[PDB]
Design a protein around this ligand. Structure first.
Ligand SMILES: O=S(=O)(c1ccc(S(=O)(=O)N(Cc2ccc(Cl)cc2)C2CCCC2)cc1)N(Cc1ccccc1)CC1CCNCC1
Length: 143
């Protein structure tokens, strides 16, 4: 199918270059990285500071490249605790220019760290509109 082939083309041309999280209130950097966590088929890992769990809101910046044009680039992210979905987040970037590099700022808005750590999976789905480009997993440790 044409839609399957396009999804792979977009996947093929897609790269996450760097990313970070800040406390929304203070603007202070909780975490940053250049590990491409979008990469499917691999269980990624990330160590975040436990104080992030007390933030009312977190500001995330992503920087990505795409060789392919996308009309409605967006993400669905699901927070699993021991295999149980606890929340779902939706973010929309919109139109992506072919061969562009883009910064995307999104705002994200309770068990203790010690219970959560190692038991939280973030499952991220990359879409162009209804077309599923990629599915990726990150296990979180809180330190
Ligand atoms: O601090 S969090 O653990 C968290 C922050 C940021 C992310 S993320 O989506 O921005 N990101 C996952 C991710 C981002 C982009 C991509 Cl492409 C792939 C994966 C990770 C976080 C650590 C490294 C990057 C996921 C989870 N936490 C998620 C959560 C919700 C309910 C119960 C437990 C945990 C964020 C909330 C923020 C508001 N205050 C309460 C916690």
């Amino acid at each position: 199918s044409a839609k399957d082939e396009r999804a792979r083309e977009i996947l093929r041309g897609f790269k996450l270059n760097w990313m970070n999280l800040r406390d929304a209130e203070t603007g202070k950097i909780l975490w940053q990285g250049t590990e491409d966590l979008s990469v499917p088929g691999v269980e990624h890992e990330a160590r975040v500071p436990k104080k992030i769990l007390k933030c009312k809101a977190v500001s995330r910046e992503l920087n990505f490249s795409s060789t392919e044009q996308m009309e409605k680039f967006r993400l669905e992210q699901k927070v699993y605790f021991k295999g149980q979905c606890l929340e779902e987040w939706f973010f929309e970037f919109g139109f992506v220019i072919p061969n562009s590099t883009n910064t995307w700022q999104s705002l994200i808005e309770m068990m203790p760290a010690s219970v959560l750590t190692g038991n939280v999976i973030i499952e991220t789905k990359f879409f162009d509109d209804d077309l599923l480009v990629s599915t990726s997993r990150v296990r979180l440790f809180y330190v």
